[PDB]
Design a protein around this ligand. Sequence first.
Ligand SMILES: Cc1ccc(-c2ccc(CCC(=O)N[C@@H](CCC(=O)O)C(N)=O)cc2)s1
Ligand SMILES: [Ca+2]
Ligand SMILES: [Ca+2]
Ligand SMILES: [Zn+2]
Ligand SMILES: [Zn+2]
Length: 159
Amino acid sequence: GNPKWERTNLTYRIRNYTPQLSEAEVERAIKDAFELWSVASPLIFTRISQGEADINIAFYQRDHGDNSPFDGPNGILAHAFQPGQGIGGDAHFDAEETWTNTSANYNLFLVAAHEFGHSLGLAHSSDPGALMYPNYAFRETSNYSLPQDDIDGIQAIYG
Ligand SMILES: Cc1ccc(-c2ccc(CCC(=O)N[C@@H](CCC(=O)O)C(N)=O)cc2)s1
Ligand SMILES: [Ca+2]
Ligand SMILES: [Ca+2]
Ligand SMILES: [Zn+2]
Ligand SMILES: [Zn+2]
């Protein structure tokens, strides 16, 4: 339905952490993941440590109150809701995963980056090179930039 945010400065909050990474590694992964979309659009992402952000980020297991349960290790890594009020925009990560910042399954930055596409209103692409491809695979992250198909997608929505 072409659901999109109607402001360019959006806020986010990290509500909890996974045990497999320092808080600063989680924080860094989320920040970089938002930055990939920011360098390609008018969107500006601002962190809050509490209170009511546009995008809540959380790690949960199995049933977690939104009627799309997670499934234990592998399979669904994360999900995220389309722009909108309330749960709109929020991104949940399967606490049962191995979460890394290395080439080993699963790179938290890469999964967040994909999820935030969904959070900003993108659907999946059929382009096997795109971030918004429906399946995960690791790609070099040390200066990962948005693939051109995903630049096209975010620009199509937000300029
Ligand atoms: C370098 C990359 C290119 C593409 C990457 C990617 C692709 C897909 C994911 C999520 C993979 C995932 O968890 N998919 C749920 C649906 C939720 C959703 O679509 O977000 C399922 N299996 O049903 C994470 C990362 S990483
Ligand atoms: Ca899972
Ligand atoms: Ca929200
Ligand atoms: Zn959820
Ligand atoms: Zn997806």
